Prior knowledge:
The complex is a heterodimer of chains A (76) and B (316). Chain A is α+β, with helices and mostly antiparallel strands and 76 residues long. Chain A has a single domain, classed as Phosphatidylinositol 3-kinase Catalytic Subunit, Chain A, domain 1 (Ubiquitin-like (UB roll)), CATH 3.10.20. Helix content of chain A is 16%, strand content 33%. Chain A has one helix and five strands. Chain A has a five-stranded mixed sheet with strand order 2-1-5-3-4, covered by helices on one side. The longest helix of chain A has 12 residues, at 24-35. Chain B is an alpha+beta fold and 316 residues long. Chain B has three domains: 1-60, Ubiquitin-like (UB roll), CATH 3.10.20.540; 61-179, Helicase, Ruva Protein, domain 3, CATH 1.10.8.1190; 180-316, Jelly Rolls (Sandwich). Chain B is 24% helix and 36% strand. Chain B contains nine helices and 19 strands. A seven-stranded mixed sheet of chain B has the order 10-13-18-14-15-16-17. A five-stranded mixed sheet of chain B has the order 2-1-5-3-4. In chain B, strands 8, 9, 11, 12 and 19 form a five-stranded antiparallel sheet that branches. In chain B, a hairpin with a 2-residue loop joins strand 6 and strand 7. In chain B, helix 3 (80-91) crosses helix 6, helix 4 (112-121) crosses helix 7 (166-174) and helix 5 (131-141) crosses helix 6. Chain B is elongated, with a radius of gyration of 22 Å. Chain B starts with a strand and ends with a strand. Chains A and B meet through strand 4 of A and helix 4, helix 7 and strand 15 of B. The structure holds zinc ion (ZN). Zinc ion binds at residues 190, 192-193, 225-227, 229, 231 of chain B. Zinc ion is lined by residues 190, 192-193, 225-227, 229, 231 of chain B. Chain A: It comes from Mus musculus (Mouse). Chain A: Residues 73-76 are annotated as: Involved in the ligation of specific target proteins. Chain A: The record marks 73 as: Interacts with activating enzyme. Chain A: Residues 1-76 form the Ubiquitin-like domain. Chain A: This is Ubiquitin-like protein ISG15.
Amino acid sequence: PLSILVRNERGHSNIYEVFLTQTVDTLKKKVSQREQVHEDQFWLSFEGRPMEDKELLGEYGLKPQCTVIKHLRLRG
Amino acid sequence: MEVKTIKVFTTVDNTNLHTQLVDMSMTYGQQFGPTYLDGADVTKIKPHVNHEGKTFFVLPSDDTLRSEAFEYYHTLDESFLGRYMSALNHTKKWKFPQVGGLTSIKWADNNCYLSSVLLALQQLEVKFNAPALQEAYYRARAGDAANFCALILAYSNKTVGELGDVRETMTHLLQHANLESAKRVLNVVCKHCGQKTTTLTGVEAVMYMGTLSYDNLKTGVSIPCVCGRDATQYLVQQESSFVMMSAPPAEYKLQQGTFLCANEYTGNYQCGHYTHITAKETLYRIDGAHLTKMSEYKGPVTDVFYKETSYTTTIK
Ligand SMILES: [Zn+2]
């Protein structure tokens, strides 16, 4: 029931089908899977707000065709 | 026949420690109520042999403290207080040396990234809206930082011992910061698609990824455009106390008087090390407790901070 765009910081973007009631963890798994990057190795924001693994995607107010940003995490 | 068990320490106030044997066939939640470890909620997991010797924070399911949490921490996460206090059990064993006139942290538990965060914040005209958060910030500026670091782990959803990313941590913290009148206007120009103006507020107004140079962003930076072509983006207008400019760690030159401070990152994405560079009368490099000074500097940098008040470009 919702299609959104996840955009890398290296330019690329990919479409994901999500429900507002899946977790951020779930969506990270969808992204890990599609983009072949471990889940520990990146984070997601929506409109400046970091997305927390445990939270439902709905909490961030995602709409159809909105852009979630994928950020590579430096493991310092 | 004996029951599989481990010895762990338990505490409801971070001062008093009681020894406990835990039964391996039941979650901690079944045995102690709501229970936390290293900043994680372990209420619903079973004991693991590796938890032996660890200290656990137990915090009864009360929901009176839910009102406390909201008003003092600006959070509705019921797990927040427990995560915060279990972390605090560790961060109280961290040492906080006063180095080059700032509070820093002695190496332990992969806390180099939190050291950078702490060092950087002290130089920014910034402030936090969550009362307990601000008070902790205040105290960390005076050398008493255990609480602030635990809140940082907690607001960022990190555990003690976990490798981390300064930019990612800053993004979590700044959600709680006094940035309600921070403002940024960017113009994007694509030959094919044309010209479009973007107005940002809050965190997104003071934070940028793609270049370490505040000059580059004013004079224009290349960004991919919807149409596939590369387009130019530049800073139209900026009203804020500071800006944070980030980029994948690259070899980079820091010249005294052209920046506030910055984070060096050595290593690779899988495992690395942060140190902090600030500018007083000369350049200071802070690597936890260890300090080096130098008139100039060159190395792998990934965030650079600048002081700001108001900016207006001189391009159309
Ligand atoms: Zn275009």
